[PDB]
């Protein structure tokens, strides 16, 4: 398995889902023998540009270590979940931890 620094921001008035989403993700990841080396939460932070209105979103970090197979099953879930908006995900670059 490789590392993947994923940071997905969710709709503001959807914060209640933030915990549910996170808990669900981590589950699948760990299930496939994945390793979580970090997990931030920038919370309801101000947005630079009005990304599709609502200049306020809810960010979160991951930087896990799951097989490309699973993250893929996830890369799509984000697209099929109105609740979440812009989603990014970088590669390994050596398991990042804490800080940020």
Partner 1 sequence: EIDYKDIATLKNYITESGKIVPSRITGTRAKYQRQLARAIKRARYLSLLPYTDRH
Partner RNA sequence: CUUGAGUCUCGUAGAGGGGGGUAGAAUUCCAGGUGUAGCGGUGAAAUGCGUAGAGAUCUGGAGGAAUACCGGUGGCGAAGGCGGCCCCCUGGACGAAGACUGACGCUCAGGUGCGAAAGCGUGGGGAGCAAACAGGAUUAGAUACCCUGGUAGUCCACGCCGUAAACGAUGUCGACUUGGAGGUUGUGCCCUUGAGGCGUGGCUUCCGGAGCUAACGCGUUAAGUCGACCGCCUGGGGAGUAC
* Residue 39 interacts with partner 1 (CB under 8 A): yes or no: no
User: Given the rule CB under 8 A, which of 10-18, 28-36, 45-53, 69-77 is the region that contacts partner 1?
Assistant: 45-53
From 10-18, 34-42, 46-54, 55-63, span contacting RNA (CB under 7 A): 46-54
Site for partner 1 in 55-74 (CB under 8 A): 57, 59
> Is 90 a binder of RNA (CB under 7 A)?
yes
Q: Are 10 and 21 in contact (CB under 8 A)?
A: yes
| Sign, CA torsion 90/44/19/17 | negative
For the chain, how are helix, strand and coil distributed in percent, rounded to 5? 30, 25, 45
Q: Which two tokens stand for residue 26?
A: 């981590």
Q: Does 54 bind RNA (CB under 7 A)?
A: no
């Amino acid at each position: 398995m490789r590392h993947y620094e994923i940071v997905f921001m969710v709709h503001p008035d959807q914060s209640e889902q933030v915990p549910g989403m996170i808990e669900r993700y981590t589950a699948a990841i760990t299930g496939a023998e994945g390793k979580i080396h970090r997990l931030e939460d920038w919370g309801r932070r101000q947005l630079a540009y009005p990304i599709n209105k609502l200049h306020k979103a809810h960010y979160v970090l991951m930087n896990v270590e799951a097989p490309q197979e699973v993250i893929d099953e996830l890369e799509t879930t984000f697209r099929f979940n109105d609740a979440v908006i812009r989603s990014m995900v970088m590669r390994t670059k050596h398991a990042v931890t804490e800080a940020s």
